[PDB]
Amino acid sequence: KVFGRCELAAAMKRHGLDNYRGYSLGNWVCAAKFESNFNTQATNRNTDGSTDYGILQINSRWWCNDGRTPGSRNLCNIPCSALLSSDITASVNCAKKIVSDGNGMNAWVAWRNRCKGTDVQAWIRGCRL
Numbered sequence: 683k684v685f686g687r688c689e690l691a692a693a694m695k696r697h698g699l700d701n702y703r704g705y706s707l708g709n710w711v712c713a714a715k716f717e718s719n720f721n722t723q724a725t726n727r728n729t730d731g732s733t734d735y736g737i738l739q740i741n742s743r744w745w746c747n748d749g750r751t752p753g754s755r756n757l758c759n760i761p762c763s764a765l766l767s768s769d770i771t772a773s774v775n776c777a778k779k780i781v782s783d784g785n786g787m788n789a790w791v792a793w794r795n796r797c798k799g800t801d802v803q804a805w806i807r808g809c810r811l
């Protein structure tokens with residue numbers, strides 16, 4: 683599924699992502715925009731042989747099982763395929779553990795380089811929430 687900006691804002695809020703670990707809804711929408719372009723089925727292979735999955739490009743090295751990432755953990759206890767669902771619940775649950783891991787949203791390199799310190803409220807601007 684390819685979410686609309688305000689539609690994804692609403693979905694993230696309904697799953698309690700807004701202000702989770704102190705990150706405003708804008709931060710999550712901006713991260714999604716530049717990780718997946720709001721596409722739930724986005725997959726990207728890393729040079730290390732891990733793969734990133736879904737709206738928030740969660741990596742098979744630590745967080746999900748894809749059966750082809752040697753030496754890897756599955757700390758969200760889910761197949762990486764569940765992160766490609768049109769229902770964002772599995773992605774949200776697992777992003778909650780990632781952003782709790784110690785480095786906050788710096789875990790998403792695209793968030794650090796493209797959203798951190800920017801006017802992230804523009805991402806939820808005009809959205810009925």
Ligand code: NA
Binds near residue numbers: 745748754
């Ligand atoms: Na894994």
